[PDB]
Design brief:
This is part of a larger assembly, with 4 copies of chain A (449 residues). Chain A is an alpha/beta fold. Helix content of chain A is 48%, strand content 15%. Chains A, B, C, D: It catalyses: L-glutamate + NAD(+) + H2O = 2-oxoglutarate + NH4(+) + NADH + H(+).
Chain lengths: 449, 449, 449, 449
């Protein structure tokens, strides 16, 4: 696209100093050519130009006291990127590496991923260069309060709803929430997501990701006049996602037959489908042993040190662990086995080489982690609904909506790809669907933002 | 607990002029040692010391004119005790006896009770020393208006939601509400509970306490590997609570065999199980005669002047009228008949002594009124949810919710006591459960409040 | 007045547990019959009955951490007594003795006093049971921050403006202010008085009380067809008040002949009239020794251990130190020397008895401390005006204003007593004047408050 | 200073990407060692670390429509650097080069500058990358409206008061104001300075800078036991600043003998001391000829094409035009002429090399532009005052105040430098006095900001 290309160039020049942000913009816009080309009206209202500039950026000073009475100062950021479709929403990262470029790129991606969920959620990102590593509980507490003392005025249940991320967990969330409540003098607990159950957190949080991934695979199966029952799945990891996935597959008639730790991997032909087997997974995460072999020990199964489960012949490939777990050569094995379903779960588990690769393959079904792992985001939106309704949903109610929306996600992606004649391209469809809802709202909304 | 003991000590010293508040604290905390004993972290952050002091207290002047044009002045209160788990919530009492001691004592309890419902509700209590008895409708209107003219600024749907109590009913709630919406200039109907259906009240209000009590019982049966079928019950009172209780027991297959009034008790061995019988209760209440004898003269049954039915032989005891209805005397009568189910419904229908006594009773199942009569409170939370959703639920939906919650309440109480190594002690269970949630919440929220 | 008597009665009954408040009411109202007797309209609208009840009272929890990381909890108060003539105004006291009784009693007086200044200022009083003695600077900072985190919402430049008092000085005011501006996110520096000059404090703060007292006196002279020239004065204390008083008397041509300390008194017949003499007072105060004797050892003058100077012969008596400094004993000494000018400066430097006694004294002119020491208060009002104007006045401008106002105060007091047919009674004058303005205001404002 | 050194280095590593800001910090901080050295407590509270991070930064998207209906997008900024001593205050710049670094460096300087005026004003800077070059009035109007649509929420009379700067004059100010007043629904005209008189602008705006500089010189004179009577002054430029300086100089008995333009200079040994000559300047400014020669032509005085007036023998040198007017070469000319008074008027009219140098001359008086040219800032502060007072000051009143404050700026500057043993160093004195008021306020305010 001419417009696309032009916009990218401008950004390249204007934000040469925010490299992360720059890369992200390129990558994103690069792949909307068609959609844009199909929409000349966008250009007349400088839609893309508006899109690449956050609606509002907030930076602020954060002075805080350590345990020895020593004074420190950090910087706080809150980037409210896009709010056309819902309140701003997005995590807070506390890490020494935090800067505007990082916040911008993260916040830009955020709007897209949130759009995709089908829920009314805008996109934002925030954080601080504060380094939680090595700090006492009390110190984290003090920092969190100082942080919120300024932050509070820029957010709210109908404005901006933050959540955790690198460095920000349930504990920080609780600390920020206490400070918020005190300042504002009311409850307004939906101002934050990722809360403990005692003050409004949601049921099904842990399982959310693994479960959601399975429900997505199901919609794929359905699309293809196929089914989950009887399917074999190759997983990576033994962590939370892998666990949720394993449990939900079993429950649906399918079965996971591999897992992988740093040590290599296990192969369970009977499937990781028993109560014991599935919880034992909880066991190991806990232990700390980073040893995928504990399973092989416990259960009497094949352990494959310095190995990756990608050589195994299964029906479904589902990497739930590390980044770049599937490389060019790993993918080759997968294709040699003629596997038809490649479902990304973890973030960026596939190399680009790999990705372009499997991507050529005419027989295969490739699904992007951003649509596939959206369960986590969904449950945070549910938390919001529950807080607004002033009641808690049962775990069955939560699971239900999760199933339902994940289905909408798969389907919406596919229809979009089809609309722009790409066929059944799930990777592209995800990109397109998030973008389009945003574009449509902005168009209907006129030139204000 | 030394901690507990000590904290208790301090309160006695510091609030010597607040006799009521002092007792309550005493009574409630003394009962928590084991929880406290296992939660060493609580102390480090002065948990109990903070809990005993209300977050915020408000008192204000209330001048008002009478039908003669004469001016009067009263004082209004609002104690916002704890809002860690929800917005402040608690009724308003208009009685000449009203003072801060009383407000504080009710507010303190209100929070534990509110916590136990499983809904996101805080604790508060307010009212005035105004005396509505003898006042014309218009004077009552004038008073409510003046009262709200100041109060409005301290409350709100997401802050503090009051309700009625001694002296405060629907009429008053209506007047207060009319003034609030006029001042604020919006709807915000969830600012108060106990409203008429025309401007947001819930269905099932009247049946509420009565029904939840039974649902509570039902959960007891189940625990006990038992059933409601063919059981007999001894009820005290003939009011709205007794009436709802009777209705439902009957639908459940059990039967109420006693009623009670200020003039003695009645005996009806066939059981108060017919429409006609049941509806008679409402005529009785409506007449305002306060004579339980009219049932007896109507239906031709046994009538025992000057006596409490605490001597009849039944499976289940349910005091639904007054305070310290049951005494050691009447306690003995009961045990003597070896009855195993003692279910307080009314507020404190038993003397602390009768209470111990009953508890010692190795065969008996004793249930606390604060857990048991929680249906009136649940219904007010549902009223809030419906106002938030901008729609009305059906009586069937209310009822079903009521039903699931009551069960959870019983169930939660049981595992709490269960966790403390106290067994099936529903009395301590109710305490421990309410406290624990507040503690968890305050703990996660840090030192802000 | 029967009205008065009756109202007094009710207060005693109703607030029996508020001994301090009860006295004050008693004392203040008993003194107003004639005003009340001539204002029949007051009764019809229940004027006194409303006045005795604060418009609004606030109490709140204040948790704070110490240098060790140990948590403490205190209670904060803010009584907003009367705002009919200006925003609420009154200091904050941090003392272990703090309770509602005390807050109420100070708040009640604060309003009369504030009314008498002729400036548009209401009455209020607040504080905490926190005890600053023994606390590190940082702990004090932490406490102030916590205290303001809640208070902020109840105060403001046009609502309620607090100041310092026992336990609350510049340091504290600074900490409170830093927290306030951070929370509110604006300047609004007129929210508090007694601020350092760097962020809005006034010039002439220290001299204030001392100077106004003299200006007050000057107005007495004038009334009396007299002069300050060549008069001698007996001062008590050597602090900031005594110092300002001495300075100015001296500029006015009169002379201070006594000083007093906890260790006795001094006699300096030449008069404390030189720069060196006068500045010595500041070194003395600064040393923190609390020995009036150092003046004597320095300047070589008379020194009377264990004695009050109330026995020296002078034209004018000005107690500037403590409470119930003057007694019947010392009263006699004075009268005996036939001294005609008794000017309270310090707060209640006299026993009610010594007080009557003096008043009976047909030749004497007795002046009340609340009228006389009003300069400290005037200066805080000027601080407010300067903050509102966004500029600083010169010491000359402050001083001149101070000067005109003090005169009006004396003059207004005189015509008030004058109007009641009590003659040159400046003690009743001060009462009547303060009350009258409040009454007129509340009368014009209707029954709202 | 080791602390200072340490701070400067961190900013350098940290903000490498904002060279202009990095550069200003080093320059300002490096000139403060002695105050710092004298104040070890600053370092304990991380004072300098805090000062270098603005309190709050806001960036926002600005979409706007041109006359042809084409849509444009720009970025809006507002850096609220420091508000310890007053509401944030600082101008807005509309230029294509605007970016954060730029905004930060200017807002940082602004704090020190505002501090130094003695008025209660914080420091801030804002603007947009919008290019007013070539925009119709209507487009400018539209941009201003869009800009203020988001900005309004972050400013206000007691919060942040912007003003003009490069690209923002009375036209823009008026457009922004109309939009503000419309959104907020009230007057609040003190939200912006530089307003037209019709809606709250102040008299004496144009003369302010010129007049104020003369008032400052008058203070130097008096400190040096000299007078302005009889002095000849060499001015640079013929604009507004030069014009006001000349007029005030004449009034006070001195005389300007030179004016300069890009064309060379004129010498009027008789003095530009007549209404005709003075007003002529005005006509020269308007003409658009941009030629100093016009004056020579008009009044028959000497014109020296291609030259600067720095070789003329005069008593006082006052550069009122370009930055870097005076270089090492020109400075030697002055030194060589044995001139004692060198008064910078325009911003940075002296090169660093030249400044240093002049600074080494012992017989000289060197005054920084930052203090001398403050008359402009002062009258904006006076605008705020009149707006709060709801009235307009007469030109005399304004002039009178300007006069008084200017003297205070000089004297305060002198006092500071000397308090640090620098003698009569007006250059460092300005630095120290600005910084000092801020440091003091921040220390008193605690660890909030």
């Amino acid at each position: 696209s001419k417009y696309v290309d032009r916009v990218i160039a401008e950004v390249e020049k204007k934000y040469a100093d925010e490299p992360e942000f720059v890369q992200t913009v390129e990558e994103v816009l690069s792949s909307l050519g068609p959609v844009v080309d199909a929409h000349p009206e966008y250009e007349e209202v400088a839609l893309l130009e508006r899109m690449v500039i956050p609606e509002r950026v907030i930076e602020f000073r954060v002075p805080w006291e350590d345990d020895n009475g020593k004074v420190h100062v950090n910087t706080g950021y809150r980037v409210q990127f896009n709010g056309a479709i819902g309140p701003y929403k997005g995590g807070l990262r506390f890490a020494p590496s935090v800067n505007l470029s990082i916040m911008k790129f993260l916040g830009f991606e955020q709007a897209f991923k949130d759009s995709l969920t089908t829920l009314p959620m805008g996109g934002a990102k925030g954080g601080s260069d504060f380094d939680p590593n090595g700090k006492s509980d009390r110190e984290v507490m003090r920092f969190c309060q100082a942080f919120m003392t300024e932050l509070y005025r820029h957010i709210g249940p109908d404005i901006d709803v933050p959540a955790g991320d690198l460095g920000v967990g349930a504990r920080e969330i609780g600390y920020m929430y206490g400070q918020y409540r005190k300042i504002v003098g009311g409850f307004y607990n939906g101002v934050l997501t990722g809360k403990a159950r005692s003050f409004g957190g949601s049921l099904v949080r842990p399982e959310a990701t693994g479960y959601g991934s399975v429900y997505y695979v199901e919609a794929v199966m359905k699309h293809e006049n196929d089914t989950l029952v009887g399917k074999t799945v190759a997983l990576a990891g033994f962590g939370n996602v892998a666990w949720g996935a394993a449990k939900k597959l079993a429950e649906l008639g399918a079965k996971a037959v591999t897992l992988s730790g740093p040590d290599g991997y296990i192969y369970d032909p009977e499937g990781i489908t028993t109560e014991e087997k599935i919880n034992y997974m909880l066991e190991m995460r806990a232990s700390g042993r980073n040893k995928v072999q504990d399973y092989a020990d416990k259960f009497g199964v094949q352990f494959f040190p310095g190995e990756k489960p990608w050589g195994q012949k299964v029906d479904i490939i589902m990497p739930c662990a590390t980044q770049n777990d599937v490389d060019l050569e790993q993918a080759k094995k997968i294709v040699a086995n003629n596997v038809k379903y490649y479902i990304e779960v973890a973030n960026m588990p596939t190399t680009n080489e790999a990705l372009r690769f499997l991507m050529q393959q005419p027989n295969m079904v490739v699904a992007p982690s951003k649509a596939v792992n959206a369960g986590g985001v969904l449950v945070s939106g549910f938390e919001m609904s529950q807080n607004s309704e002033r009641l808690s949903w049962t775990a069955e109610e939560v699971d239900s909506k999760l199933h339902q929306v994940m289905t909408d996600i798969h389907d919406g992606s596919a229809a979009a790809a089809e609309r722009y004649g790409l066929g059944y391209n799930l990777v592209a469809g995800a990109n397109i669907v998030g973008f389009q809802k945003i574009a449509d709202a902005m168009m209907a909304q006129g030139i204000a933002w």
